[PDB]
Amino acid sequence: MHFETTKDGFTIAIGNRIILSHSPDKPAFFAGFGEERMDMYRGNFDIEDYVIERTALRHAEVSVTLSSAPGQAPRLRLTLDGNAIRLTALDETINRLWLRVVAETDEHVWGGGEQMSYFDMRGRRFPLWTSEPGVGRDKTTEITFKSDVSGKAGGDYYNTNYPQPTWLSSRKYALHVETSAYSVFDFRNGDFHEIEIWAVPEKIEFFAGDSFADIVSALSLHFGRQPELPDWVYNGAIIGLKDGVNSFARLEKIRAAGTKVSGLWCEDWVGLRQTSFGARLFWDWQANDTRYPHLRQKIAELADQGIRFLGYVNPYLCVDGPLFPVAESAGYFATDVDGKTALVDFGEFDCGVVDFTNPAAADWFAAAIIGKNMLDFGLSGWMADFGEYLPIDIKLSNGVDAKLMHNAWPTLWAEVNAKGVESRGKTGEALFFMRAGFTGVQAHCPLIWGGDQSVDFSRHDGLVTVICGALSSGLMGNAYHHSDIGGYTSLFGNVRTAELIMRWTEMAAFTPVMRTHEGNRPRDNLQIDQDETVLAHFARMTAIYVALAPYLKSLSAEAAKTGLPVQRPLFLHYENEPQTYAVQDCYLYGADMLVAPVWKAGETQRSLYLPGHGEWVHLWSGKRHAGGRDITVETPLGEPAVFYRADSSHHRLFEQLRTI
Ligand SMILES: O=S(=O)(O)C[C@H]1CNC[C@@H](O)[C@@H]1O
Ligand SMILES: [K+]
């Protein structure tokens, strides 16, 4: 950065780009004090602040100290240090800070973690607090209304399992706030962005470069990159079943249709806790002999067939399981204000929270559960779930306020998984996937999944939200994203259709990982093995995925070398084309393919903007289309709107896909 004096105050810039501007009349910082309410109900948060003070820091003295007015005691010190602005609270009573960053009227801003509704965040406000993302997520839909009424569970456009206080600006810089406190990105004003933080962050860090790609590279180096995808993934789809021993018979039927399979993922490897409300799992992280009486043998048999086995784990322990008394005896649970084990309500059962701030507890979970019970048992991967349910009234062994540990949790959890994996020498071979995140998850977690979508084509909780989650999380340095094929949440009569499964499968073939899921109510929802048309369509798309493996491998190698995500926004490679900047329902699958998933029912065609000044080749027909215009193509089931660059080095490969 470059600091510079002006008539009335100062500016801070990154090269050509003014970032902060301060004068008494147009101050950069405001400081104050609030009393928040943050009530948790089954991982949903009802958050409302009561602001008692918000006071402009109008007087700057030059390292810069800031006070409310001349002759008042300084409240904030700002120190420029390389690409960082370091902040020190001089008034210990501040628990609210607002920072204005200079903005241009037509500027776009992206990132914010994994955003599910809006990719370009301009014009709206985005609180950053990990939680349940919501069912429906749109106060105008009946699903959302019903979820709010029954369980405070509808959420809204800004809720996410993985927030992050980082943005990329169309002005060619990125900004990162180093804090785990609650924060908000307010992009509602034309002339400035405003950051609200419920703390004085240690620093704000900046990244700039001459391309957006270069900035994403630099961000990915800052947060940490992922290993390349393991070879075994490229064998096909990961088939999600939760049907006990019957899972194997159903897998055989799936394989008999020609489906290419890399793995069998059985989240019920620990037992099902079937309830009147849903087919839940038994949260005790060891193989269940009642549900899978020969599981060790079955894993070995599948391995001989070239199919891996994957499970399920989360960082909580159910009160009625055998691991709970072990963890409690050792003092490894978060505690309540009286020093007893704090129990969290997950609906049909209560759990303890393994306290990862206690190094012994974190080591125990990595060694006993990830190491012995999972990896040594023969798992090649798993869903590494949750991370969002830390309540703010719980006590942690490190003595740090739960208001600050809440957002840190997903990263601590990712690190426990990564340490277990590394302890067995399996980094880059074991594949675990997380839905929750925060700053730093990038370094530990090798694969994101989009969490729970409704089983529908809705705008704010259906298929299309996955694309937004992939694009946003990709710019934040998570190179690999995928989703549950066919979505997850079935409530209030909302159930899958054949069409939904097929469209979702079409997208998933052009992402790093194809994975199915029977969902929360398996017997109420269509599954890939239960309709012959769906199953044949699925098998065909898995053959397309396998044929594409050499190209996906090259993208994984690129991700390791340069940090660029596999699924990229159009603007990353077409910077001079304004119409690419807000597009969030299409992506570049590497530089050489363009994917425009169908995300509504009953569509026989798809319209999209084709970028560039060359030619794109339609994957299924071989017909050529000129870049630089809107086009419409036929998209019958099995033929998603996918194109490849005419000049691609992988053209011989892409030509073959037409034939399969
Ligand atoms: O029903 S359970 O809560 O036990 C398991 C679910 C948890 N969230 C993610 C889903 O994919 C799981 O099926
Ligand atoms: K959701």
XYZ file of C-alpha atoms and ligand atoms in Angstrom:
674
model
C 0.000 0.000 0.000
C 0.771 3.640 -0.407
C -0.296 6.153 2.243
C -0.758 9.739 1.082
C -1.677 13.004 2.783
C -4.516 15.229 1.353
C -5.920 18.800 2.203
C -8.258 17.477 4.982
C -6.824 13.995 5.766
C -5.393 10.895 4.054
C -5.828 8.137 1.501
C -4.544 4.593 1.340
C -4.160 2.965 -2.063
C -2.933 -0.262 -3.664
C -0.986 1.017 -6.647
C -3.310 2.929 -8.943
C -6.370 2.095 -6.677
C -7.613 4.257 -3.765
C -9.030 1.955 -1.056
C -9.533 4.195 2.016
C -10.223 7.902 2.053
C -10.473 9.910 5.264
C -11.451 13.465 6.087
C -13.346 14.922 9.068
C -16.475 15.266 6.843
C -16.073 11.901 5.025
C -14.444 9.618 7.633
C -13.256 6.093 6.912
C -13.872 4.627 10.378
C -16.734 4.641 12.928
C -16.392 3.063 16.396
C -18.913 2.071 19.011
C -20.693 -0.351 21.232
C -23.544 -2.831 20.906
C -25.447 -5.450 22.871
C -26.334 -8.366 20.634
C -28.889 -11.147 20.871
C -27.952 -14.389 19.105
C -30.432 -17.127 19.980
C -29.668 -20.587 18.515
C -32.425 -23.034 17.692
C -31.184 -26.244 16.043
C -28.362 -24.381 14.328
C -30.535 -21.502 13.146
C -29.605 -18.134 14.643
C -31.976 -15.276 15.374
C -29.524 -12.369 15.476
C -30.378 -8.793 16.322
C -28.058 -6.040 17.559
C -28.868 -3.099 19.769
C -26.415 -0.362 18.806
C -25.748 1.948 21.750
C -22.990 3.957 20.087
C -21.768 4.492 16.540
C -19.437 7.442 16.404
C -17.388 8.703 13.489
C -13.633 8.878 14.001
C -13.238 12.293 12.436
C -9.730 13.258 13.619
C -6.595 11.607 12.243
C -2.993 12.204 13.346
C 0.115 10.786 11.616
C 1.087 4.883 11.734
C -2.213 6.898 12.202
C -4.220 7.451 15.401
C -7.943 8.199 15.164
C -10.169 10.015 17.677
C -13.781 11.139 17.569
C -12.753 14.855 17.380
C -9.665 17.035 18.016
C -8.526 16.982 21.656
C -10.340 13.737 22.517
C -8.565 10.536 23.495
C -7.493 8.364 20.518
C -9.608 5.217 20.094
C -7.921 3.375 17.209
C -4.385 3.069 15.824
C -3.852 2.133 12.215
C -0.397 0.865 11.115
C 0.450 0.168 7.490
C 2.620 -3.007 7.155
C 3.323 -4.449 3.666
C -0.059 -5.372 2.140
C -1.789 -5.075 5.552
C -3.458 -2.402 7.592
C -2.947 -3.420 11.258
C -5.524 -2.131 13.745
C -5.114 -1.701 17.497
C -7.993 -0.733 19.781
C -6.855 2.103 22.104
C -10.293 2.303 23.703
C -10.929 -1.141 25.259
C -14.744 -0.551 25.328
C -15.177 -0.700 21.498
C -16.982 -3.814 20.325
C -18.314 -2.382 17.072
C -16.218 -1.125 14.184
C -17.296 0.144 10.770
C -14.841 0.714 7.935
C -15.738 2.364 4.627
C -13.908 1.341 1.472
C -14.096 3.553 -1.598
C -16.313 2.117 -4.334
C -17.400 2.953 -7.879
C -21.038 2.985 -8.969
C -20.814 0.063 -11.450
C -18.299 -2.044 -9.357
C -18.942 -5.745 -8.751
C -17.886 -7.597 -5.598
C -17.655 -11.349 -5.232
C -16.667 -13.892 -2.602
C -17.958 -13.796 0.969
C -17.192 -17.488 1.443
C -19.676 -19.866 -0.134
C -22.636 -17.653 -1.106
C -25.723 -19.625 -2.105
C -28.046 -16.906 -3.479
C -26.029 -14.034 -4.899
C -22.552 -14.234 -6.531
C -22.126 -10.525 -7.242
C -22.917 -9.170 -3.742
C -23.308 -5.569 -4.895
C -26.521 -3.849 -3.736
C -27.151 -6.054 -0.689
C -25.966 -6.713 2.855
C -24.287 -10.007 3.897
C -23.849 -10.956 7.555
C -21.008 -13.522 7.987
C -21.878 -16.151 10.608
C -21.798 -19.856 10.051
C -25.164 -21.542 10.582
C -27.763 -23.713 8.995
C -28.170 -22.048 5.570
C -31.988 -22.330 5.653
C -34.649 -24.498 4.032
C -36.104 -22.429 1.132
C -34.157 -19.320 2.015
C -36.801 -17.036 0.449
C -39.557 -15.482 2.595
C -41.893 -15.519 -0.429
C -41.985 -19.309 -0.772
C -44.275 -21.640 1.068
C -41.364 -23.978 1.953
C -39.531 -21.128 3.684
C -42.715 -19.971 5.487
C -43.452 -23.520 6.699
C -39.839 -23.962 7.833
C -39.912 -20.666 9.773
C -43.191 -21.512 11.452
C -42.282 -25.063 12.403
C -38.583 -24.615 13.355
C -37.235 -21.108 12.758
C -35.519 -22.800 9.828
C -36.328 -20.942 6.619
C -33.311 -18.651 6.635
C -32.630 -16.087 3.954
C -30.359 -15.137 1.013
C -27.268 -14.407 3.118
C -27.264 -17.507 5.353
C -24.503 -20.066 4.652
C -22.625 -22.953 6.236
C -19.450 -21.185 5.059
C -19.132 -17.413 5.324
C -15.791 -15.678 4.948
C -14.928 -11.988 5.351
C -13.057 -11.801 2.035
C -14.006 -10.101 -1.245
C -12.723 -9.718 -4.747
C -13.511 -6.379 -6.393
C -13.926 -5.693 -10.122
C -11.398 -2.918 -9.464
C -8.718 -5.709 -9.378
C -7.972 -6.066 -5.713
C -9.126 -8.336 -2.947
C -9.623 -7.531 0.719
C -9.510 -9.929 3.622
C -10.507 -9.176 7.232
C -8.520 -11.188 9.816
C -11.196 -11.868 12.485
C -13.490 -14.667 13.587
C -16.037 -12.255 15.048
C -19.444 -11.659 13.574
C -19.108 -9.289 10.651
C -21.177 -7.825 7.841
C -20.424 -6.751 4.291
C -22.800 -3.887 3.428
C -22.750 -3.217 -0.350
C -25.933 -1.097 -0.442
C -24.248 2.271 -1.130
C -22.984 3.437 -4.505
C -19.894 5.383 -3.332
C -18.558 2.979 -0.695
C -18.597 -0.517 0.726
C -18.975 -0.713 4.536
C -17.613 -3.455 6.734
C -19.184 -3.930 10.164
C -17.156 -6.020 12.626
C -18.124 -6.961 16.189
C -14.488 -6.542 17.241
C -11.449 -4.552 16.196
C -9.750 -6.935 13.772
C -6.017 -7.561 14.056
C -5.599 -6.596 10.406
C -7.105 -6.088 6.993
C -5.040 -7.570 4.149
C -5.008 -6.622 0.475
C -4.087 -8.423 -2.749
C -3.852 -6.864 -6.167
C -2.715 -7.906 -9.627
C -3.248 -7.230 -13.308
C -5.728 -10.079 -13.773
C -8.483 -11.553 -11.617
C -6.722 -14.939 -12.110
C -3.544 -13.510 -10.561
C -5.516 -12.253 -7.561
C -7.221 -15.622 -7.065
C -3.756 -17.238 -7.252
C -2.452 -14.914 -4.535
C -5.519 -15.488 -2.336
C -5.150 -19.262 -2.657
C -1.487 -19.053 -1.584
C -2.596 -16.966 1.436
C -5.320 -19.425 2.631
C -3.574 -22.634 1.411
C -4.267 -24.872 -1.562
C -5.693 -28.346 -1.747
C -3.951 -31.516 -2.890
C -4.685 -32.777 -6.393
C -7.727 -35.053 -6.565
C -6.798 -38.712 -5.896
C -6.625 -41.072 -8.898
C -9.377 -43.311 -7.599
C -12.021 -40.549 -7.880
C -11.779 -40.643 -11.660
C -13.196 -44.192 -11.779
C -16.738 -42.854 -11.636
C -19.513 -41.812 -9.289
C -19.650 -42.159 -5.535
C -22.950 -43.954 -4.921
C -24.747 -42.743 -1.756
C -26.863 -45.366 -0.034
C -28.137 -45.579 3.556
C -30.004 -48.866 3.343
C -27.863 -51.141 5.519
C -26.973 -54.538 4.001
C -29.514 -53.864 1.261
C -27.185 -51.095 0.018
C -24.978 -53.782 -1.602
C -27.785 -55.347 -3.612
C -28.831 -51.910 -4.826
C -25.214 -51.066 -5.753
C -25.085 -54.248 -7.861
C -28.214 -53.177 -9.762
C -26.681 -49.745 -10.345
C -23.480 -51.361 -11.616
C -25.448 -53.806 -13.889
C -26.812 -50.784 -15.767
C -23.203 -49.888 -16.768
C -22.742 -47.137 -14.178
C -19.082 -46.256 -13.608
C -18.531 -46.363 -9.821
C -15.544 -45.082 -7.850
C -16.960 -45.492 -4.370
C -19.833 -46.588 -2.145
C -20.655 -43.930 0.438
C -22.793 -45.308 3.319
C -23.464 -42.544 5.864
C -25.356 -45.130 7.930
C -22.087 -47.105 8.515
C -22.650 -45.988 12.160
C -26.288 -47.061 12.337
C -29.534 -45.380 11.402
C -31.623 -43.659 14.079
C -34.896 -43.771 12.151
C -37.494 -41.353 13.538
C -40.973 -40.248 12.660
C -39.359 -37.108 11.163
C -36.471 -38.492 9.129
C -33.914 -41.255 8.623
C -31.216 -39.880 10.853
C -27.863 -41.470 11.773
C -26.551 -42.710 15.130
C -23.867 -40.180 16.110
C -21.199 -42.486 17.526
C -18.236 -42.677 15.138
C -17.466 -46.377 14.813
C -18.639 -49.101 12.485
C -22.002 -50.515 13.565
C -22.104 -54.355 13.551
C -25.900 -54.391 13.778
C -26.375 -52.308 10.616
C -23.379 -53.686 8.601
C -22.432 -56.999 10.246
C -19.619 -57.812 7.775
C -18.545 -54.287 6.899
C -14.793 -54.896 7.112
C -15.075 -57.860 4.731
C -17.337 -55.874 2.384
C -14.874 -52.994 2.194
C -12.152 -55.481 1.189
C -14.421 -57.103 -1.425
C -15.291 -53.710 -2.911
C -11.605 -52.745 -2.988
C -10.850 -55.880 -5.058
C -13.485 -54.592 -7.553
C -11.837 -51.141 -7.732
C -14.521 -49.445 -5.560
C -13.642 -47.475 -2.426
C -15.754 -47.142 0.725
C -16.720 -43.843 2.328
C -18.423 -42.972 5.577
C -19.698 -40.082 7.730
C -18.468 -38.252 10.833
C -19.214 -34.997 12.643
C -17.654 -33.283 15.628
C -20.429 -34.016 18.179
C -21.204 -37.229 20.163
C -24.706 -38.434 21.017
C -25.456 -38.810 24.727
C -26.654 -42.418 24.298
C -23.521 -43.651 22.502
C -20.492 -45.432 23.935
C -17.950 -42.778 22.927
C -19.750 -40.102 24.933
C -18.669 -41.426 28.413
C -15.081 -41.776 27.156
C -14.892 -38.189 25.972
C -16.693 -36.980 29.136
C -14.355 -38.880 31.516
C -11.318 -37.394 29.778
C -12.699 -33.800 30.002
C -12.952 -33.417 26.201
C -16.368 -31.750 25.971
C -17.265 -28.059 25.912
C -18.868 -27.105 29.185
C -21.769 -24.981 30.490
C -21.399 -22.023 32.864
C -21.494 -24.519 35.833
C -18.627 -26.687 34.467
C -20.887 -29.619 33.391
C -20.892 -31.066 29.844
C -22.916 -28.732 27.636
C -25.584 -30.576 25.704
C -26.827 -29.302 22.336
C -30.260 -30.153 21.019
C -30.239 -31.568 17.487
C -33.959 -32.338 17.548
C -34.518 -36.041 18.276
C -31.367 -36.368 20.428
C -28.773 -34.368 22.320
C -24.968 -34.387 21.941
C -21.789 -33.160 23.547
C -19.432 -30.929 21.577
C -15.854 -32.249 21.417
C -13.782 -29.201 22.443
C -11.143 -28.718 19.766
C -9.653 -25.818 21.709
C -8.348 -28.467 24.109
C -5.301 -29.880 22.177
C -5.707 -33.290 23.910
C -9.324 -33.512 22.765
C -8.438 -32.477 19.204
C -5.596 -35.086 19.169
C -7.891 -37.728 20.571
C -10.531 -37.156 17.872
C -7.854 -37.269 15.081
C -6.155 -40.429 16.484
C -9.095 -42.470 17.878
C -11.872 -41.583 15.477
C -10.380 -40.324 12.141
C -7.276 -42.579 12.510
C -8.386 -45.833 14.156
C -12.084 -45.961 13.529
C -12.190 -44.594 9.996
C -8.865 -44.769 8.113
C -7.535 -47.934 9.785
C -10.965 -49.535 9.304
C -10.551 -49.096 5.524
C -12.411 -45.865 4.646
C -10.920 -43.887 1.725
C -13.034 -40.857 2.560
C -16.107 -39.498 4.269
C -18.604 -36.666 4.686
C -17.034 -34.491 7.420
C -20.239 -32.742 8.450
C -21.354 -29.843 10.646
C -19.203 -27.206 12.270
C -21.952 -24.518 12.468
C -23.748 -25.230 15.755
C -21.476 -23.721 18.406
C -23.786 -21.697 20.704
C -22.498 -18.451 22.120
C -23.200 -19.406 25.794
C -20.899 -22.527 25.785
C -17.494 -22.499 27.541
C -14.291 -23.541 25.787
C -11.108 -24.830 27.362
C -8.959 -22.059 25.788
C -10.999 -19.442 27.694
C -11.874 -17.593 24.464
C -15.431 -16.298 24.178
C -17.764 -18.574 22.169
C -18.759 -15.426 20.219
C -15.280 -15.583 18.741
C -14.934 -19.411 18.538
C -18.229 -19.936 16.710
C -16.894 -18.931 13.253
C -13.462 -20.534 13.950
C -15.047 -23.952 14.493
C -15.277 -25.182 10.924
C -11.559 -24.535 10.394
C -10.608 -26.280 13.651
C -12.785 -29.210 12.595
C -11.206 -29.306 9.091
C -7.774 -29.377 10.790
C -8.747 -32.396 12.981
C -9.739 -34.284 9.823
C -6.517 -33.246 8.019
C -4.285 -34.273 10.969
C -5.883 -37.711 11.142
C -5.400 -38.171 7.430
C -1.766 -36.994 7.580
C -1.086 -39.331 10.566
C -1.773 -42.271 8.212
C 0.238 -40.788 5.303
C -2.976 -40.393 3.295
C -2.978 -36.660 2.419
C -3.942 -36.558 -1.269
C -5.428 -40.040 -1.196
C -8.200 -39.861 1.470
C -11.104 -37.679 0.311
C -13.196 -36.006 2.950
C -15.685 -33.292 2.166
C -17.119 -30.472 4.275
C -20.127 -28.195 3.979
C -19.012 -25.770 6.711
C -16.113 -23.407 6.499
C -14.457 -20.207 7.514
C -11.102 -18.534 6.837
C -8.424 -21.239 6.607
C -10.595 -24.240 5.783
C -8.817 -24.145 2.392
C -5.570 -25.475 3.864
C -7.124 -28.562 5.465
C -10.216 -29.588 3.521
C -9.610 -31.186 0.062
C -13.227 -30.936 -1.187
C -16.320 -28.765 -0.473
C -19.884 -29.845 -0.937
C -22.818 -27.433 -1.226
C -24.574 -28.679 1.944
C -28.307 -29.317 1.952
C -30.415 -28.095 -1.015
C -34.122 -28.632 -1.168
C -35.156 -31.381 -3.581
C -36.328 -28.833 -6.159
C -35.515 -26.273 -8.841
C -36.123 -23.263 -6.570
C -34.157 -20.088 -7.022
C -32.926 -19.840 -3.450
C -32.561 -23.443 -2.334
C -32.543 -25.641 -5.418
C -30.165 -26.806 -8.108
C -29.064 -23.335 -9.236
C -27.733 -22.376 -5.793
C -25.005 -25.001 -6.120
C -23.457 -23.068 -9.018
C -23.349 -19.882 -6.945
C -21.743 -21.810 -4.057
C -19.112 -23.246 -6.439
C -18.261 -19.894 -8.046
C -17.996 -17.920 -4.843
C -16.082 -20.600 -2.861
C -13.752 -21.031 -5.892
C -12.682 -17.411 -5.834
C -11.911 -17.855 -2.122
C -9.412 -20.661 -2.968
C -11.506 -23.824 -2.637
C -10.726 -25.381 -6.013
C -13.127 -28.332 -5.776
C -16.911 -28.167 -5.179
C -19.742 -30.639 -5.655
C -23.298 -31.283 -4.534
C -25.717 -33.984 -3.533
C -27.144 -35.257 -6.824
C -30.871 -34.626 -6.561
C -30.582 -32.363 -3.481
C -31.200 -33.342 0.155
C -34.118 -31.739 2.033
C -37.526 -33.266 1.572
C -40.160 -31.696 3.858
C -43.733 -30.466 3.549
C -44.499 -32.677 0.600
C -41.503 -31.450 -1.445
C -40.153 -34.668 -3.092
C -37.825 -35.370 -6.020
C -38.889 -35.843 -9.589
C -37.104 -37.925 -12.230
C -36.379 -34.705 -14.082
C -34.773 -33.110 -11.087
C -32.412 -36.060 -10.628
C -31.489 -36.056 -14.325
C -30.783 -32.335 -14.529
C -28.714 -32.469 -11.357
C -26.711 -35.477 -12.723
C -26.070 -33.493 -15.960
C -24.402 -30.718 -14.010
C -22.518 -33.067 -11.677
C -20.757 -34.875 -14.588
C -19.030 -31.547 -15.271
C -17.780 -31.056 -11.707
C -14.964 -32.747 -9.748
C -17.166 -35.359 -8.058
C -20.388 -37.178 -8.883
C -22.050 -38.263 -5.607
C -25.615 -39.384 -4.889
C -27.543 -39.271 -1.575
C -30.778 -40.923 -0.514
C -31.572 -37.784 1.597
C -33.490 -37.229 4.827
C -36.530 -39.327 3.859
C -35.296 -42.067 1.474
C -38.567 -43.936 1.111
C -40.492 -40.775 0.190
C -38.085 -39.763 -2.605
C -37.081 -41.227 -5.915
C -33.563 -42.677 -5.958
C -31.294 -43.301 -8.963
C -31.908 -47.076 -8.942
C -35.741 -46.841 -8.869
C -36.588 -45.561 -12.338
C -35.069 -47.229 -15.438
C -34.884 -43.975 -17.432
C -33.173 -42.130 -14.599
C -30.723 -44.999 -14.029
C -29.785 -45.243 -17.777
C -29.335 -41.486 -17.891
C -27.157 -41.672 -14.740
C -24.997 -44.483 -16.171
C -24.465 -42.525 -19.395
C -23.449 -39.372 -17.520
C -20.953 -41.391 -15.426
C -19.398 -42.612 -18.721
C -19.090 -39.004 -19.825
C -17.430 -38.110 -16.500
C -14.919 -41.002 -16.837
C -14.138 -40.023 -20.457
C -13.489 -36.467 -19.252
C -11.067 -37.564 -16.534
C -7.899 -36.560 -18.379
C -9.220 -32.988 -18.725
C -10.388 -32.812 -15.070
C -6.921 -34.156 -14.029
C -5.268 -31.298 -15.939
C -7.560 -28.839 -14.095
C -6.640 -30.392 -10.740
C -2.958 -30.041 -11.623
C -3.617 -26.376 -12.533
C -5.386 -25.868 -9.174
C -2.380 -27.228 -7.269
C 0.082 -25.121 -9.307
C -1.838 -21.764 -9.618
C -4.761 -22.046 -7.185
C -7.462 -21.510 -9.809
C -10.699 -23.302 -9.095
C -12.030 -25.998 -11.382
C -15.350 -24.137 -11.782
C -14.592 -20.545 -12.811
C -16.808 -17.496 -13.429
C -16.887 -16.279 -17.048
C -15.220 -12.983 -16.168
C -12.035 -14.722 -15.052
C -11.131 -15.484 -18.688
C -13.182 -12.751 -20.440
C -12.319 -9.602 -18.504
C -13.210 -7.205 -21.346
C -16.786 -8.505 -21.640
C -19.056 -6.676 -19.091
C -21.895 -9.142 -19.643
C -19.847 -11.935 -17.992
C -19.459 -10.145 -14.632
C -22.701 -11.063 -12.872
C -23.387 -14.455 -14.555
C -23.927 -17.096 -11.817
C -25.802 -19.944 -13.479
C -23.009 -20.838 -15.960
C -19.384 -21.620 -15.377
C -16.137 -22.253 -17.212
C -15.050 -25.839 -16.442
C -11.425 -24.951 -16.780
C -10.579 -22.453 -19.522
C -11.739 -24.757 -22.340
C -15.348 -25.769 -21.575
C -18.503 -23.767 -20.791
C -21.363 -25.350 -18.844
C -24.873 -23.837 -18.608
C -26.950 -26.181 -16.482
C -30.764 -26.278 -16.907
C -32.185 -25.253 -13.494
C -35.954 -25.204 -14.088
C -38.527 -27.882 -14.794
C -40.032 -28.341 -18.244
C -37.213 -26.651 -20.186
C -36.322 -28.117 -23.628
C -33.842 -25.283 -24.451
C -31.264 -23.134 -22.701
C -30.249 -19.545 -23.463
C -26.893 -18.181 -22.370
C -24.187 -15.651 -23.160
C -21.243 -17.204 -25.107
C -18.087 -15.192 -24.414
C -15.001 -14.431 -26.533
C -14.243 -13.637 -30.151
C -13.560 -17.183 -31.367
C -15.829 -20.160 -31.772
C -17.289 -22.593 -29.295
C -18.269 -26.116 -30.298
C -21.488 -27.580 -28.914
C -20.472 -30.833 -27.232
C -23.293 -33.136 -28.394
C -23.795 -31.893 -31.999
C -20.327 -30.611 -33.007
C -22.050 -27.469 -34.382
C -20.023 -24.301 -33.979
C -21.249 -21.053 -32.347
C -19.566 -17.629 -32.564
C -18.537 -16.069 -29.244
C -19.733 -12.600 -28.152
C -23.537 -13.034 -28.188
C -26.544 -14.657 -26.550
C -27.486 -18.085 -27.990
C -30.126 -20.705 -27.464
C -29.518 -24.469 -27.825
C -31.694 -27.560 -27.508
C -31.220 -29.284 -24.119
C -33.165 -32.490 -24.061
C -32.469 -34.749 -21.097
C -28.924 -36.147 -21.516
C -27.685 -33.186 -23.538
C -26.860 -30.305 -21.219
C -25.761 -27.014 -22.772
C -22.018 -27.642 -22.810
C -19.485 -26.144 -25.234
C -15.738 -26.385 -25.789
C -13.293 -23.976 -27.381
C -12.610 -24.852 -31.052
C -8.901 -24.234 -30.422
C -8.702 -26.381 -27.265
C -5.689 -28.711 -27.003
C -8.128 -31.312 -25.667
C -10.303 -31.210 -28.771
C -9.711 -34.924 -29.670
C -11.050 -35.858 -26.218
C -14.050 -33.534 -26.463
C -14.882 -34.943 -29.937
C -15.082 -38.472 -28.427
C -17.769 -37.391 -25.876
C -20.177 -36.844 -28.729
C -19.816 -40.585 -29.570
C -20.524 -41.884 -25.984
O -29.676 -37.178 9.506
S -28.401 -36.833 10.025
O -28.281 -35.415 10.628
O -27.916 -37.772 10.985
C -27.233 -36.819 8.694
C -27.290 -35.676 7.680
C -26.594 -34.467 8.287
N -26.389 -33.291 7.452
C -25.883 -33.649 6.083
C -26.664 -34.770 5.388
O -26.088 -35.030 4.101
C -26.727 -36.017 6.281
O -27.513 -37.061 5.662
K -30.408 -25.235 2.256
